[PDB]
Design a protein around this ligand. Structure first.
Ligand SMILES: Cc1noc(C)c1-c1cc(Cl)c(Nc2ccccc2C(=O)O)c(Cl)c1
Ligand SMILES: O=C(O)CCC(=O)C(=O)O
Length: 434
């Protein structure tokens, strides 16, 4: 395999022929006022220490990401990649002062890049022609941007690009996950400073999925250049980042698929689960209205969703959002209080299966509905606490160390149930032996 750069004569016709949905807008197309404001916003956030490497999990192993990031976007929105849910540092859409100005700056860049995307998509459809204006606006309605930073000198050894000889990789081949179908991606690239591609210049590489025979493209990215992935390019093609000599920032604006990833959604899920609870007063006497299996199954599934997809995802990042914003403090306190009530709900269900007047075919109706949720609850609870207590988790600085919140001992009296459910879950299967 080989690759092509602007040094090659075939580079320009391959881009024209086989990458027409990849658009490059060089820094000359962007106002110099916007350049300085965006580049200073990058440095403002970097000085305040707002960008963090994530401790993700890929195929069983825990990995520190080579790139430090921060998610900025609509209030209450989340973006999930590599099993890590990032929460937006909010930007001011209608309805810490330095950091808030940087978020307003990248809100302005988002408006600009959204317009450029709509125009590029309109010019794209016209070329393919020779109702759908709703699709174009929605596929460019960016709700978040994932800011990035990497210093290549800090790595003792960078990975070689393994298929086309593109040299050192900062980020390996991948798709951008959890995006609205056929939504576009706009990137603002900010680089701080013969045989093949220039090793000192940052590039974005492109290849066709499953294809290492078709030579890939290595697009040089200078300071202030913008590139756009239109329509199904992000799905049909993979991209990587080829490292240069000096550090580089980037602002990657996305239409995150957030149908199950906003605060309003998960709060609504929590209210749906608590509709099966007598809500006169918030005490330890939790009494359920119905024990119909579908209602209890849905209740324990929502219980798991708020705990693992929201509570433990958030506190695994060790209150590092607090360095940027306080926006998630009350919502996370509210979600935990809602989750605590669901712990009392689970205790109430276990109290009912332990009751004498219950006929066995109603008792087994309940167990068949709740055991898949309780199984996943304990399997995921130890996966999360194991990741909180791993060697590489120790190596992180103090104010981003993973916290296994919520966590409590068997000594703790305020919680109706223990953290370890192995005795309880094994009991309920030994209960449908007899
Ligand atoms: C997947 C995905 N979706 O959105 C983003 C952003 C990613 C994503 C984000 C990243 Cl930080 C990477 N890179 C890595 C992540 C963890 C460990 C190593 C690497 C690496 O490339 O060396 C990849 Cl491959 C993909
Ligand atoms: O850094 C970039 O240009 C975007 C590449 C990418 O997928 C990312 O790291 O977010």
């Amino acid at each position: 395999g080989s690759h092509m750069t602007p040094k090659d004569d075939e580079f320009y016709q391959q881009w024209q022929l086989k990458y027409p949905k990849l658009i490059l807008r060089e820094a000359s197309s962007v106002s110099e006022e916007l350049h300085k404001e965006v580049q200073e916003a990058f440095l403002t956030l970097h000085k305040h220490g707002c960008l963090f490497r994530d401790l993700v999990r890929i195929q069983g192993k825990d990995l520190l990401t080579p790139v430090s990031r921060i998610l900025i976007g609509n209030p209450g929105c989340t973006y999930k990649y590599l099993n890590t849910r990032l929460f937006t540092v909010p930007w001011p859409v209608k309805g810490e002062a330095e950091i808030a100005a940087a978020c307003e700056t990248f809100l302005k860049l988002n408006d600009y890049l959204q317009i450029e995307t709509i125009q590029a998509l309109e010019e794209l459809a016209a070329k393919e022609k020779a109702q759908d204006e709703v699709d174009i606006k929605s596929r460019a309605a960016y709700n978040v941007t994932l800011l990035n930073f990497m210093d290549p000198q800090k790595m003792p050894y960078l990975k070689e690009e393994p298929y086309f000889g593109m040299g050192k990789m900062a980020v390996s081949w991948h798709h951008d996950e959890n995006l609205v179908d056929r939504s576009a991606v706009a990137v603002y690239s900010y680089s701080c400073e013969l045989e093949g591609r220039d090793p000192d210049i940052w590039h974005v590489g492109f290849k066709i999925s499953w294809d290492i025979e078709t030579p890939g493209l290595a697009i040089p990215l200078h300071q202030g250049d913008c590139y756009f992935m239109l329509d199904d390019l992000n799905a049909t093609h993979q991209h990587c980042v080829l490292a240069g000599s000096q550090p580089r920032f980037s602002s990657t604006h996305r239409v995150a698929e957030c149908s199950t990833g906003t605060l309003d959604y998960i709060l609504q899920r929590c209210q749906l689960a608590l509709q099966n609870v007598c809500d006169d007063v918030d005490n330890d006497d939790v009494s359920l209205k119905s024990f119909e299996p579908a209602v209890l199954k849905q209740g324990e599934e929502i219980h798991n969703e708020v705990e693992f997809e929201w509570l433990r995802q958030f506190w695994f990042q060790g209150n590092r959002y607090r360095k940027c914003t306080d926006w998630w403090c009350q919502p996370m306190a509210q979600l935990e209080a809602l989750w605590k009530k669901m712990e009392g709900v689970t205790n109430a269900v276990l109290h009912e299966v332990k009751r004498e007047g219950l006929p066995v075919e109603q008792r087994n109706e309940i167990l068949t509905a709740i055991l898949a949720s309780l199984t996943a609850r304990q399997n995921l609870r130890r996966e999360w606490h194991a990741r909180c207590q791993s060697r590489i988790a120790r190596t992180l600085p103090a104010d981003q160390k993973p916290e296994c919140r919520p966590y409590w001992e068997k000594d703790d009296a305020s919680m109706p149930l223990p953290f370890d459910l192995t005795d309880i879950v094994s009991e309920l299967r030994g209960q449908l032996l007899e």
